[PDB]
Motif scaffolding. Structure first.
Motif, mmCIF file in Angstrom:
data_model
loop_
_atom_site.group_PDB
_atom_site.id
_atom_site.type_symbol
_atom_site.label_atom_id
_atom_site.label_comp_id
_atom_site.label_asym_id
_atom_site.label_seq_id
_atom_site.Cartn_x
_atom_site.Cartn_y
_atom_site.Cartn_z
ATOM 1 N N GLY A 3 1.020 -1.236 -0.003
ATOM 2 C CA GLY A 3 0.039 -0.054 -0.085
ATOM 3 C C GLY A 3 0.862 1.292 -0.121
ATOM 4 O O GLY A 3 1.955 1.419 -0.443
ATOM 5 N N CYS A 4 -0.002 2.268 0.275
ATOM 6 C CA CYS A 4 0.953 3.607 0.307
ATOM 7 C C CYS A 4 1.944 3.649 1.498
ATOM 8 O O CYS A 4 1.819 3.004 2.712
ATOM 9 N N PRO A 5 2.920 4.380 1.414
ATOM 10 C CA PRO A 5 4.400 4.468 2.479
ATOM 11 C C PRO A 5 3.881 5.317 3.369
ATOM 12 O O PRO A 5 4.772 5.448 4.177
ATOM 13 N N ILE A 6 3.040 6.207 3.281
ATOM 14 C CA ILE A 6 2.708 7.108 4.744
ATOM 15 C C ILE A 6 1.941 6.503 5.781
ATOM 16 O O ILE A 6 0.769 6.609 5.962
ATOM 17 N N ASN A 7 2.655 5.716 6.594
ATOM 18 C CA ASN A 7 2.264 4.878 7.607
ATOM 19 C C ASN A 7 3.136 5.224 8.672
ATOM 20 O O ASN A 7 4.198 5.481 8.713
#
Lengths: 355, 355, 355, 355, 355
Positions: free
Chosen positions: D305-309
Motif C-alpha cells: 500500500g501507500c508508504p505514509i504509515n
C-alpha cells in the motif's frame, strides 16, 4: 572574543579505539588553530586598540568634523594614487573575516571524515579485534601436547613433522575471518574518503597561497594614502577637496599575520604529503613475527596487487590499536626474538608468560 | 587575556603509572608558566593602561594632530640619536611576542618526550611491574619450609647447603625476565629521548640569554628619544621637523620583566643540570634488600659497564612507582632491617604480614 | 584581574587519608589568601581605577601637555621636600608587587611540606592502620571465652592471675609492629620538616613586619607632593620648573591595606605558636581506654623520654584518623565507660555490638 | 554578549538509542546557529564599535550640541528624501531583534518534535528492539537440525520438503508481532507530525525570504540621509532646520549579514526538501538478507500500500539504531554474502561466528 | 551582567521519579525566564549604552556644566509640564528593579511547591509503584491455569465461574494497598498546595497587569520634558531657570519591553487556567485496560464523589511515571487490544511476552 568560543566549538577533544592517528590529529589541530590564534592576537589587549586609522585634519576642523572625516573613509577605503588611477586597500578591512572563512574551510574536511567513514571503519575494527583476541585462548590449548611431545621425539618429529597436522588441525582455522578479509580487499569505498580528506587540505592550502599572493604582497609597504570626501552632498562645501595624508597604524600586525600565515602552511605541507604517501606502499615491518602466529599469518598472506585497498587502511588503523589492553601483552613482548634456532626458546617464552 | 587560555592549553595537568618525575614536572611548570605570567602581569589591570608612548606637542597643535603625531611613532620607534646615528627601540614593541615565542619554545620538548618514549616506557614498565608482582607469592610460600626444618637440623645442612637447590628450582627462576632485561640493556633508543629533552631546554635557555644580552641591556636606562614626522607627504608642512621629548611610559615594566626573566632561568639551570647528571651513575641505595628477594635479584645483578642504557631509565622510573598499591606493602616495610642474623628475623618478619 | 587565576591555582582544595592536621589548615589558608584578596580589593571596580596621581597644572597648559606632565611623574615618584631633601614615594607604585611576592613567599613552605614528608607519612599511616584494623577481631577470639570463667569463679584466682595468662599468651602479640614503632621512634627525619614548616612562616611574618615598619608608616599622612619636569631635554623650555600641588588620590586604600595586613598577621601569629607547641608534649587524653584495648596498648606503652620523635607526629596524624569508616565504630562508642567493675559491662557492651 | 549564552541554551547537545538523524542534526544546527553567529559577528570586537550614526554638524555647534543632534536621530531614523516624501530606515535599527526572532522561530519546531512525538515513538522502538533481538538464537538452533539431515539425505528432500514445516512450526512463528504490525500499518498518528515539523521549517524559510525581499533590498546602496530636529519644542530656535549629510557608518555589516542570511537558507532549502521526500518511498536496499531471518522477515513481509504509515518512520529510526552493541554483530557481517548456494556457506558462516 | 548568574541561580535544572508535569515545567520556565531575558536585552551591547538622558544646554555652558545639568536630572526625573502641574517619569528609572522583583515573585511559588508537597508525594509514589511492581507475576503466574483447563472444559464451568474463586484467593488481593488508597482519598493536605501554587501565579499575573496599566501606558509617547535646577543653593546664579528640550534616549526599549511583557503573559494565562481545570474531572481515558489486572483494578474501583482529593493528584503524577523501566513494559504494549473475545488473545498476548 568571538574566537574564544569557536576554539572549543571546533578543535575540542568506541571507548577503546583511536580513530585518528596522532599525525592527523596534530595537523588538524594546528591547521584549525593557527588562524584563530592569529585573529585573537591581532585584535586583543596585546596591541593597543582604538581608532586604527589617523588622518591629519586641518586645524580649522573641530573634533566632530575630524571624527566624521576619519570615520567616513574606512567604510570606503580607497586611495586615489597619483603614482588619477584609483587603488583599493580592502584587505586591511577584510582580514579577520578571511581568517574565519579559512578556519571554517580547513574544518570542513574533518566533518567529511567523521561523517563518511567512521561507522563502517569502527565496525570492521571491532569485529577484527574480536576475532583476534580469540587468538591467544585458542593458541595455548592448541599447542599444549607440543610441549609434552618435545621430550618424547626428535626435532624433525616435533617441529618439522608434528606440526604438519597439529597446526592444520581444525582449531585455529577461521574461514569467516579469511573470507571477510578477501571480500574487503576488493572493496575501494573507504580509501576514497582518505584521499578526499587530504586532497581538500591540499586544495585549500593552494587557495590560501593564491589569495595571499594575488591581493596581499602589493599593499605591504604602503602606509600613507589620500582619500576624498566630496563625492556627494558634501561636494558643495568650502573645505579640502582631497584629504591629505591618512595613515594606517596597524601595518605591523598585517605584516606579522601574513608572515605567520605563510610560514605555518609552508611548514605543514610536507606532513600532509607524507600522510598521503604513507598509503602508496605496503608495510611488512613486523611480518617476520606475524607469519608464525597462526592468526596473524592470514594478514600477511594477503600481500598482492596494488596497495590502494581498504585492507591497507584497516591494517594501518589496527596497528596503532594493537596495544590496547589484551594485545598489549605477549605480542608486544615478542621483541627479544630478534637476530633450527627457535626449537626451544620460541616455546619456553610463550609457555612461560601465560597470564 | 590570551595568556589565560594559553595557561590551561599548555601547562594543564596508564591509570596506575607515573611517567613524569616530580623534578621534571616542576621544571616544566616553571619554565612554561614564568613567561606567560610575566606577559600577563605586564599588560593587566595591575598597572594602568593607555598610551604606551607620550609626546610633548607644541601648544599650537590640536588634540587630533597631537594624537596623530604620537601614534605615528609607536609603530616606527626610531631614535634620531645625536649622542646623526639613528637608533631603534623595537624591543619595547616586540617584548610580548618574544615572550609568547619563548613560552612555545620551552613547551616544544615536552611534546617530543610525550610522543617519542611514553608508549614504549609505559609498555616496559607495565610488563616488568606485572611480572614482579608475582614475586611476593614466591619467598614465603616456597621458602616457608626453611625454619620449619631448621630446628630439626644443624647449621651447615639446613641453612648453607639446603638453601641451594630450592634457590635453583623451577619456582625461583624467571628466565623470560632475565632475557628481557638482558636484551633491553643493549638497547639505546630511550636514553636518547631524555638526552635531547634536557639539551633542548639548555639550548633554549642559552638562546634566551643571548637574546636578552644582545638586544636588551642597551635600551635599559634610556627613556627619552626624539622622532621625526616629515619623512614623506608631511615634508611640505610648516611645523617642527623633529619631534621633541617623547618619553616611554612603561620602562619600569620592562626592567622588572627583564630582571625576573634573568633570575628565573639562572636559578633554574642547576636543576636541569642535576637532572641530566642523575643518569650518569648506577643507583644501589637499596640493593642490599634487593639481592635477597627471589625476583628482585635479577635487577641487582645487571650493573656492568657504562650506565647509559634503557635499563637505567627503566629502573629510575620503576623506583618512583614501587609504592603504588601492591608493592606499597611489605617491600616498603623492610626498613627495620637496617644495622647468621637472618636465621630468624628476616623470616618471621616475612611470614607475619602475609596479607 | 590577575588575582583570580592565582587564587584557584594556589589555594585550591590515599582516598581515605589526611595529610594535614585539622587546625593547621587555617594558618595556611588565611596567610596565603590575605595578601591576594587584599591585592584584589586594592584596585577593583568598587574603588574605580583611572589616574592614581593628579596634579594642578596651570591654566595656560593644554590637555595633552598637562597629561604628559602628570604621566611623567607616576613612574618617577620623587618628592622635592623642603621640610632640598629628595624623598621618594615608591611604595604607592610597589604595593601590588610586594603583595604578590608575599603571596608566593607564604605558599613556598606548603610546597616544602607537600614535597618533603607526604610519601613516608602516608606509607607509615597505611601500615599502622592495617595493623590496628587487624587489632579489632581479638576480643571475640581469645578474650570472649576467657571472661566466660568468672561465672564459674570469683576473681582473685581467675581474673587477676589467669587473665594475664591469655594477655601474655601469643595472640595479643605482634613483634613486627613493635619493631616498626621502635625503629620509627628513634628516627627524626619528619619532625625537622614540621619545624621548618612552622619556622618559615614565623620568619616570613617577621620579614613582613620589618618591611611594613621600615618602609611604610612614614608616607602615611602625606597626600600632597611636588615634582619636577625640567631634568633633561625639557629643561630649556619656558614653563614652571617645579610642579605645584600634586596629590595622590589613592591614599585611603593604602591605609586600609596596611592596617588589614597588620591586623590579619598579628591575629594569626598565636595560631602558629600553638601549632608549633602542640608537638612538645605527649598526649594522654584517652590513654586509659588505649591501655586495655588489644593492640592499642603498644602505642601507649612506648611513651618515654623527650617527646620530639617521629612517633609523636605519627600519633598526632593517627588520632583523628581513628574515625574513618571501620574504626568509626565501637571505638568511638567506648565513651560511656567513663567514671572489679570490668567484670561484665566492659564486655557486654561490645558483645552486643559485634557488627 | 547575549548571543553566547543562547548558544548552549538552545542548540546545545534511553541511554542506548538515536532518536534523531544526523542530517536533521545538521539542519537544526545550521538553521539555529546561523542567525546567532551573524548577531555575534555583527556587534563584536571584530569591527570597531561606537556611534552607529554620524552627522556633519556646523562648526558653530559645540560637542554636547552635536551629541544631542546625532543622538536624537538614531531612534528616529527617517530620511526626508526629496527624490518631501519621507523614507524610514528602521531595518538598520531592528536587524538584531529580527535575527533573535528568527532564532526563536527556528527553535520552536524542534521543541514541538521533542515534546509531541518522542513519547509515542520511544516505547514502540524499545519493544521492537527486544522482540527483534529474540531472533539470534532463534535462527541457529531452529535451523540447526537441517545439516544433521543434509549429510544423510540429498535431492530437495532435506531442504525443500523437510525444511517446510519448520518454517511455520511454533518456534518460528511470532504471533505477538503480527497483530502489532497489522495495527501499526493502518495508523496515521505519528506519521502526521513529521510533515508538520518539516513544513514549519519550510514556511519559516518562505517568511524569511518575504521579509528580506519586501523590507530589505530597498535601503541597500543608501549610505547618506537627511533628518530634522525642529519638530517640537526646539522648533523656535536659530539653527539648521534640516540636518545635512548624516551618514550610516555600519552599512558593510548590513550587506554582509543580508548576503549570508540569504545564502545559508538557499543552501538549506534542498536538504530539507530531501528530508521531506525521504518518507515517500519504501526502502528495500538490503531486504534480501532480511527475508531469510526468523524475526526479520515479518518486517519485509509487510511492505504494501501507500508508504505514509507509522511503519515507515519506525523502520527509518530502527535502521539507524541497528548497530548499537548486540545487533552490532553477525547482522553487520552479512556483507560477504553478496553476489543451491545456501546449502553450506550461509550456515558455516552462521555457526562459525557464535560469539 | 547579573542576569547571567540569576539564570542558573533560579531556573537551573528520587533518581527515577518525575515530580513535575511537562506543562508545569514549561510554564515555570517561561514565566521565570522572560523577565531576565528582557532585562538583559534592555541593558546589553545590542543597543548602544551611555547617557540615558540628553539635554540641549546653551552654548555658553562648559562641558562640566553640561554634564552636571544633564546628570542632576537623571536622579530627579520630574517633568515641569505646562500642558504648573508637576508630572513624574520614575518608571523609566525603576524598570530594571521592577523586572527583577517580578522575576523573584514568579519564582516564589516554585519554592513552596518544592518545600510543601515533594516529600509526601515522593513517599506515596514510591510505595504505590513498589506495590504495583509485584502485579506482573500475579496475572500470568496465577491465572496461567485458565486456558490450561479451558480446552478440557465448556463455556460456563471454566471461564464464568471457575474464574470466580481464584480471583478471590490469597494471591489476587492487596489489602494494604486498598486501605492506603482509602485513607489517602479522604486527605486534602496536598491538593491545597496545587491550588495555592496556581492561584499565586494568577494573582501575580493580575498584579503585573495592574502595575502595567496604572503606571505605564501614560508616559508612553512622551519623549521630551523640561526640568529645573534652581531649587536650592544654585538658585542665586544667573543662568536659565528651566531647562529646554531634555529628551529620553531609550524610549524604544521601553516600548518593546512593555509590549513583550504584556503579550507573553496574556499568551501564558490560558496554560495556567488549563492546568488548574485539569484537576476538576476524573480521568477515565484508559480504565478499560485497568479494570482486569489484579492490582490495577483497585485504582479503577475508587472513583466516587467529588474529584478534589489526594487520589486525583497522585493518579495524575503516577500516569506520567507509568513508563519508567518496569511498568515501561507489557502494560504499555496493551495497545493492540483496541476494538467472549478475550477467550484467547487476552491470554496468548500475556503469556507470549513473559520477560
Amino acid at each position: 572574543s568571538l574566537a574564544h568560543t569557536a576554539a572549543e566549538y571546533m578543535l575540542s577533544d568506541l571507548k577503546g579505539l583511536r580513530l585518528e592517528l596522532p599525525l592527523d590529529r596534530i595537523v588538524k589541530f594546528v591547521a584549525v588553530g593557527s588562524p584563530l590564534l592569529l585573529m585573537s592576537l591581532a585584535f586583543a589587549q596585546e596591541f593597543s586598540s582604538g581608532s586604527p586609522i589617523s588622518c591629519f585634519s586641518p586645524s580649522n576642523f573641530s573634533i566632530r568634523q575630524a571624527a566624521y572625516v576619519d570615520s567616513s573613509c574606512w567604510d570606503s577605503l580607497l586611495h586615489h594614487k597619483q603614482d588619477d588611477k584609483m587603488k583599493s586597500l580592502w584587505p586591511h578591512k577584510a582580514l579577520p573575516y578571511s581568517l574565519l572563512a579559512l578556519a571554517l574551510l580547513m574544518y570542513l574536511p574533518v566533518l567529511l571524515w567523521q561523517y563518511a567513514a567512521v561507522p563502517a571503519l569502527s565496525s570492521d575494527l571491532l569485529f577484527i579485534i574480536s576475532e583476534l583476541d580469540k587468538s591467544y585462548n585458542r593458541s595455548i590449548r592448541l599447542v599444549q601436547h607440543m610441549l609434552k611431545i618435545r621430550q618424547k621425539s626428535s626435532d624433525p618429529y616435533v617441529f618439522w613433522n608434528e606440526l604438519e597436522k597439529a597446526r592444520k588441525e581444525r582449531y585455529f582455522e577461521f574461514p569467516l575471518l579469511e573470507r571477510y578479509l578477501a571480500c574487503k580487499q576488493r572493496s575501494h569505498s573507504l580509501v576514497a574518503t582518505y584521499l578526499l580528506r587530504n586532497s581538500l587540505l591540499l586544495i585549500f592550502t593552494s587557495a590560501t597561497y593564491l589569495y595571499l599572493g594575488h591581493f596581499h604582497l602589493d599593499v605591504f609597504f604602503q602606509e600613507e594614502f589620500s582619500c576624498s570626501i566630496k563625492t556627494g552632498l558634501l561636494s558643495d562645501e568650502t573645505h579640502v577637496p582631497n584629504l591629505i595624508t591618512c595613515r594606517l597604524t596597524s601595518l605591523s600586525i598585517f605584516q606579522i599575520v601574513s608572515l605567520s600565515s605563510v610560514a605555518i602552511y609552508t611548514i605543514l605541507v610536507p606532513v600532509i604529503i607524507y600522510n598521503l604517501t604513507r598509503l602508496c606502499r605496503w608495510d611488512k615491518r613486523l611480518l617476520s613475527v606475524y607469519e608464525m602466529l597462526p592468526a596473524f599469518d592470514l594478514l600477511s598472506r594477503k600481500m598482492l596487487g596494488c596497495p590502494i585497498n581498504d585492507l591497507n587502511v584497516i591494517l594501518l588503523f589496527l596497528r596503532a590499536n594493537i596495544s590496547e589492553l589484551i594485545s598489549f601483552s605477549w605480542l608486544s613482548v615478542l621483541c627479544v626474538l630478534k637476530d633450527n634456532i627457535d626449537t626451544v626458546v620460541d616455546f619456553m617464552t610463550l609457555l612461560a608468560g601465560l597470564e
